Symmetry: C2
Subunit: 319 residues, 2 copies
């Protein structure tokens, strides 16, 4: 519903404004597992769009090492659906103990993560993975807006409100390809998963958090750029390669993988967010939306089609 | 020889001093494939030891995206044994075109990379992988020294001169374990490779640049921290897990992997640099030396033992 979306945008924008108005040194996006994916996209956007110190850190590494750039003026941003994820609670409570301000995105304001946080941005029980991107996008892009580094913010932020409608349509359009991927590869002993830059988080997430953890499928996730520095030698006729393309400046690197793999393997799959219309969203924002498009396609639809063919409930853990 | 080593140290220190004396904004370590490994260790040291802006970037991603933190005051550091590696030459020539100063480490001063560079730090034809670490260490730690962030520099930098002698001894001590690893796993269809923080570059390098590229062995390299966020579900009795331990603050994260894997797989291998004496090097520097120790053990010795058992020359490429 439109009203939920406008409310979500307002809360994220209020956090961004209070952060900007208070002042800050560095922004550290700290998390673990699948929750890193949208943070890794933010980091890739930040490389091009801001001179602000922006970092993404594995929360368990960060609590063991500390960081000389993390100081009492920093803000640490965390995300946990449950708000109980041990490493995220731990880094939030560690920041709090040091007087380092924390943002928490979770679906429960009395979760331990939310109680450790300076700012809580709620997610609603029914919210799928696109909301993790949308809330982090409103937060991060509003900071850039206030810092005079995102002069398209108003239009971007309004158009982000209609991404959910576009994602429903994309998922329906993807469904036949998703069934075909799952049909052919559910019984694969080894899949190569390739993508990079702002798309790397989605390849990372889908490979480890869905296919390995929830379907016990062996994968080799590798970036498009680094594919050509050794992993390419493993490709042959019968090896599956699933390529996730970006719509930013690194699309050319993805296309090099496509051209090489198309000559070598009979088992090339291309997941291209550029194939999906985003009605009412300007083309200049497609490179930002793309990781969110792919995440919803892979986490919602492709996971469900693998589950259908394996017969292995996505809820199963052997550990 | 001692005289080669002292000369190498002097040249790296002179570059560091000229960089520091000229002034700089950010330091970007930009490379591809195996040449990233020592840069990724530097980045992990930098997280704890300096407030200077230090970045490691995949050179092909960096040339496509640019970076808003990369400006005419930055220094870009590159490494290429040949000095011909396309992506490294490309990023150096792109910096030069923009008036961005470049450091090049290569074994040939008339290589294209060396001709694009503001500073050339030579490697000698006979120099193994430890020299990539030692030259980058003298360069980076001398900058930290000049910036009043490394007050042990003198002792560190002198003790680094005796690492080569210690590495020869380590390789001889490792040789029996190396033969046993290669004997058991040369015919493996799938190996998990685990490590992290300052050790991640060595796990990354060995898995993709040696086992995949040069022996066509399928690997899953994954960090110790992130192992527990999905990849762990793939481990079972018959699955090989090679764990590379650190000697820094993330050793505890490596030990969690060890304790879990030891209960589940019959095929746990531990490569622990803490097992090797560094005579005449103070314990406080072991966490810095460790990635260099592991790199020389894996690149020199373990590669050669796999080659012996596979019969597959490390020089072979099918692409």
């Amino acid at each position: 519903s439109a009203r939920e979306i406008i409310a979500a945008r307002q809360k994220a924008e209020q956090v961004a404004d209070e952060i900007y108005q208070a002042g800050f040194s560095s922004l550290f996006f700290a998390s673990v597992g699948g929750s890193l994916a949208p943070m890794m996209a933010i980091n890739e956007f930040a490389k091009e769009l801001t001179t602000l110190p922006v970092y993404v850190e594995q929360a368990a590494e960060l609590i063991h090492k500390g960081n000389k750039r993390l100081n009492k003026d920093s803000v640490v941003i965390t995300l946990s659906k449950s708000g109980d994820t041990k490493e995220s609670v731990a880094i939030a409570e560690w920041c709090k103990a040091q007087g380092i301000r924390v943002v928490a995105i979770t679906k429960n304001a009395d979760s331990p993560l939310a109680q450790a946080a300076t700012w809580h941005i709620p997610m609603r029980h029914k919210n799928g993975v696109e909301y993790e991107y949308m809330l982090l996008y409103w937060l991060f892009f509003r900071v850039l807006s206030r810092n005079n580094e995102f002069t398209s913010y108003d239009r971007f932020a309004s158009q982000l409100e209609i991404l959910t409608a576009n994602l429903l349509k994309a998922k329906q359009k993807f469904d036949p390809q998703a069934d075909a991927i799952a049909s052919r590869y559910h019984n694969s002993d080894y899949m190569m998963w390739v993508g990079g830059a702002e798309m790397w988080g989605e390849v990372y997430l889908f490979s480890m958090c869905i296919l390995e953890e929830m379907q016990w499928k062996r994968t080799r996730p590798v970036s498009s750029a680094e594919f050509f520095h050794g992993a390419l030698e493993l490709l042959e006729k019968d090896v599956p390669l699933i390529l996730v393309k970006g719509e930013g400046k690194c699309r050319a690197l993805d296309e090099r993988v496509e051209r090489f793999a198309s000559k070598i393997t009979d088992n090339l799959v291309v997941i291209d967010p550029k194939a999906y219309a985003l009605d009412g969203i300007d083309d200049e924002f497609r490179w930002i939306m793309a990781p969110c498009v792919v995440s919803t396609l892979l986490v919602d639809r492709l996971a469900a089609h693998f589950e259908k063919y394996t017969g292995h409930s996505l809820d199963i853990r052997r550990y």
